[PDB]
Design an enzyme around this catalytic site. Structure first.
Site, PDB file in Angstrom:
ATOM      1  N   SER A 441       0.832  -1.195   0.000  1.00 23.13           N
ATOM      2  CA  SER A 441       0.000   0.000   0.000  1.00 23.13           C
ATOM      3  C   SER A 441       0.887   1.274   0.000  1.00 23.13           C
ATOM      4  CB  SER A 441      -0.947  -0.058   1.186  1.00 23.13           C
ATOM      5  OG  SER A 441      -2.044   0.775   0.961  1.00 23.13           O
ATOM      6  N   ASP A 520      -7.656  -4.159  -7.422  1.00 22.92           N
ATOM      7  CA  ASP A 520      -7.468  -3.208  -6.336  1.00 22.92           C
ATOM      8  C   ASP A 520      -8.151  -1.888  -6.733  1.00 22.92           C
ATOM      9  OD1 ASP A 520      -6.328  -1.321  -4.436  1.00 22.92           O
ATOM     10  OD2 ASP A 520      -4.584  -2.571  -4.285  1.00 22.92           O
ATOM     11  N   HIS A 552      -7.311  -4.935  -3.004  1.00 22.52           N
ATOM     12  CA  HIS A 552      -6.444  -4.455  -1.925  1.00 22.52           C
ATOM     13  C   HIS A 552      -6.615  -5.239  -0.598  1.00 22.52           C
ATOM     14  CE1 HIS A 552      -3.745  -1.032  -0.997  1.00 22.52           C
ATOM     15  NE2 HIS A 552      -4.182  -1.175   0.241  1.00 22.52           N
TER      16      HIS A 552
END
Lengths: 577, 574
Positions: A441, A520, A552
């Protein structure tokens, strides 16, 4: 010299496989509602009488908070193969594994929610709006449009209490009415609010995280007045907490609070400290008359324990050889470019010499922290024979509003220097023979900024679910993620562009592994494709790994392996040289 | 079945010692080469025990003459730059290597050791040349027109095979005393092997557009004629390929010949019982015949004929061998009335029906024979049956079948692949179908998912070709030409048979496995595919890796093989 692949796989497999539990509440009188990663997937369970019943059929992402005793659980499940467009499914606790989809609610990014039993209140983000919704026998209702990420904290009668990221990286308190709707917002000049709970006297008790301290306060939502909360025990204020993880009133009127300093938490009931095992704790519930919380540490996977005995009800077991792959852990304070002390967690591997191969593992968020909490990435690096340095760079939670808000307006700036100082320390301390960088991330963003802005600091870089281009990410984001990107870049396109790694590719001098879930919706893949086009164009050496039907938020073991395994394989291969 | 279980098996299949028979030395001992994870060693085998001849690993050994009391090692002295040196090792003193300093480092291509001299071919910066080394130093017998390989020596007569021009392998001869070169063309044929008879004629295999021919070339005048043999088993075999042939020290002629992806051994034309699969060289040792052997279910090993007992064989665990539960040839009926020769490797870890991968070979001018294939074996180990179809364009079934691909990519040959899938479900083998393949195979995977969606449950395209048009433009003349002939110099064919122009039709999950920096398989067009896949909401997996040659080491396997197997193992559970 050669990488021992089958060993790495088995170890990585067992660290993902190990069961992991989260405490969500009590239902149906005296039944713990726990979300757990078990039998390979994220699932919802009832615990009682030393047994579990599985509530869901297919894997889920979480559940809404049930007030005590409801008679049903509301499951939240991604129905978009990873892009986090969730749906809600009712399960009646007397008939487990039978789900009724709540067809009134079109799929959206569910942010939070509560089930009062008479109604279901939730916050959600769609392409055009973040919003507080309410669903009852009379259909679905939009209670209020929220200006940014919003999270429902508690509900008592008609009062609804929430937390809101509505500007400056500051967290506001909000309230609304279950029947009439509306929205009242409460800002503090002193800091950000952390947790909310509604008292029996209909006042919101909230944590308030000021410059370098945290404390408890009472807000009267009629007039907006704010006073300190006096507690009948002084252990809480004696502990002088820096952050507040969670607070909530129990059915018997007692106020449970979990606050922390330096990446470890303490539990308090009306201000008195309760014996709790060392590490971090989640919410606290009252069950069969006793206190129960989740517990975790760098060595213990999230589990469910009773206080004050600290004894486990549910817990995943690590095999001894993996237990030993962590020689120890330590919190050290690294001096950064500007003199600031960057509090840095260090896991020493029992399969690495000193000095030895070290990875600077960077946390996501950025409003998150490295703490004495179970981290699979970290444990698997230990297992593979890398020491692990985990810097709580500026922007991190857990060390006060001041340290947290320093990142705002300065992505790829001071927070990168903190990371870098952690790297430099790794060598100079004696710990590191060679440095690698790895992150998911925002932590994958760091990897990429690390390798563009600081070529030759690191030997190789793993960048997962990365941010690559603020500009293109913004265009592809939902309302809530657009607002946050604004908040984080301080509304500046110059910052957006200049602080995007993609526009600096020509400076990379190190090998780079890219890992990305194809669906994602937070950190999208489209930019990652253009990055590969740039890498290739400019003669740079990289590997890439795109994972199918995943986004994600990883909720299956297989996705977990596809995400983790190429990272470790790549780092182990780079160690051969 | 968790991934670590798959990985361990894959590691064992990659690491298993594979064996190649080189000849007989030291009077009566086998000279064998051992290969494991692409690290090569030379051994002396006799009577159970074996002895390493070399110190550090090598590239290969020169071909000994029967009995010679030494072995000549070939080792790269440059980390991978293929400029080798020669090292003598006397067979009575193993582990002691004398470098042959008279021979400067160069690309060693082939060589035969008569015992009295070392005769070899090698490439330097400015030539390919045939050399002889003996007591008085190194001589250049002949400059060669292209790459050439020494096949045999007897007396002063040297016989080899040249890549000397015209897309055909020629025979050549030289003289050990006087040197010089004599080239023997093959009009509409290509030589495959050569040996010299006691009578000083060159016996050679001459592969053609159809059946193969065992011939004698008189080196005194280039007359070539069929060689009649005492036993007519060989004429009866109607072979299509001639792997190897050489005279044994009793004067008899050993032929190893191929047909339909298997091989047979003949001795003066009489056929010997041998283990099913493919064989290398044959030698007489202790009065018995001995050959190297390989199949889809057994790694290269050394066996005695006619029994088939292994003399040397790499260890696999019992269950792993039994998971790789035998091969067979099936003739699969295709769309135009054609029968596609198709090898099937049943999995012992799969029910019947059960999951089945169609593993499409690369090339396109290649062949799936009953020969060891790590990919196929790994798939069997992970509980897939494997089905390998020799689609039109393949080699090994005559020139006509090979030339049917020309001007028709993503056409007839795709139908063959499909018919093989059709056949796998129809016959009861396959409960569910996957397609997998590298290079042209990868192109086939992309073609199957676009043109024939609903056929396969999922697909792996490795080192694939995505767009003929793009690739034609960014490529070296060498490759431009190949593309032009394949697509018939037609832009309509180039555009319409490029799967990137049909991404819309994809309905099943696609795994992409691709090199990051290889000019024969550029990455750029693959990024377009990934972009198109993503824009159109298609499910896909991608692994792009740098330096992703064939698979020898475990590292290579994890870069190129492991992602395929994991993807298919993941797809299997829906």
């Amino acid at each position: 010299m050669p990488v021992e692949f089958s060993r790495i796989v088995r170890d990585v497999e067992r660290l993902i496989a190990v069961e992991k539990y989260s405490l969500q509440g009590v239902v149906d009188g005296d039944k713990l509602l726990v979300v757990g990663f078990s039998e390979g997937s994220v699932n919802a369970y009832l615990y009682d009488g030393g047994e579990t019943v599985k509530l869901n059929r297919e894997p889920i992402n979480s559940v809404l908070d049930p007030h005590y005793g409801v008679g049903r659980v509301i499951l939240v499940r991604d129905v978009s193969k990873g892009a986090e467009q969730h749906a809600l499914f009712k399960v009646n606790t007397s008939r487990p594994g039978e789900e009724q989809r709540l067809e009134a609610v079109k799929p959206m990014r569910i942010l939070s929610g509560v089930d009062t039993g008479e109604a279901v209140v939730f916050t959600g983000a769609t392409e055009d709006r973040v919003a507080l919704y309410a669903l009852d026998g009379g259909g679905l209702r939009e209670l209020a449009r929220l200006p940014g990420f919003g999270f429902v904290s508690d509900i008592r009668g008609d009062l609804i209490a929430g937390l809101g990221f509505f500007g400056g990286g500051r967290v506001s308190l909000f309230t609304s009415n279950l029947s009439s709707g509306g929205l009242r917002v409460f800002d503090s000049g002193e800091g950000s609010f952390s947790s909310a709970s509604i008292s029996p006297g209909m006042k919101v008790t909230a944590g308030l995280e000021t410059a370098r301290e945290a404390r408890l306060v009472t807000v009267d939502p009629r007039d907006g007045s704010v006073e300190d909360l006096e507690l009948p025990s002084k252990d809480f204020s004696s502990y002088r907490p820096t952050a507040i993880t969670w607070l909530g009133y129990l059915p018997d009127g007692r106020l449970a609070v979990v606050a922390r300093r330096e990446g470890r938490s303490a539990v308090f009931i009306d201000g008195e400290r309760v014996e709790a095992p060392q590490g971090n704790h989640g919410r606290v519930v009252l069950w069969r008359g006793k206190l129960v919380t989740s517990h975790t540490s760098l060595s213990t996977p999230p589990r469910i324990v009773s206080l004050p005995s600290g004894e486990p009800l549910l817990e995943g077991g690590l095999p001894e050889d993996l237990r030993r792959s962590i020689a120890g852990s330590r919190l050290v304070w690294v001096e950064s470019f500007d003199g600031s002390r960057v509090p840095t967690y260090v896991l020493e591997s029992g399969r690495a010499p000193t000095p030895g191969p070290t990875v600077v593992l960077v946390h996501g968020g950025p409003f998150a922290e490295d703490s004495d909490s179970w981290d699979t990435f970290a444990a698997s690096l230990a297992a593979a024979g890398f020491h692990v340095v985990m810097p709580n760079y500026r922007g991190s939670t857990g060390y006060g509003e001041e340290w947290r808000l320093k990142i705002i307006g300065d992505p790829c700036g001071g927070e990168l220097e903190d990371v870098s100082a952690a790297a430099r320390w790794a060598r100079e301390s004696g710990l590191a023979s060679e440095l690698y960088i790895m992150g998911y991330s925002y932590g994958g963003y760091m990897t990429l900024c690390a390798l563009t802005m600081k070529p030759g600091l690191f030997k190789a870089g793993v960048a997962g679910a990365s941010v690559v281009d603020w500009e293109e990410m913004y265009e592809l984001s939902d309302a809530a993620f657009r607002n946050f990107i604004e908040q984080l870049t301080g509304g500046s396109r110059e910052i957006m562009r200049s602080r995007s790694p993609i526009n600096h590719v020509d400076r990379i001098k190190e090998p780079l592994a890219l890992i990305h879930p194809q669906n994602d919706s937070r950190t999208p893949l489209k930019p990652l494709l253009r990055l590969m086009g740039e890498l290739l164009a400019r003669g740079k050496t990289f590997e890439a790994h795109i994972i199918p039907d995943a986004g994600h938020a990883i909720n299956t073991m297989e996705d977990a392996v596809k995400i983790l395994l190429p990272a470790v394989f790549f780092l182990a291969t780079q160690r051969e040289r």
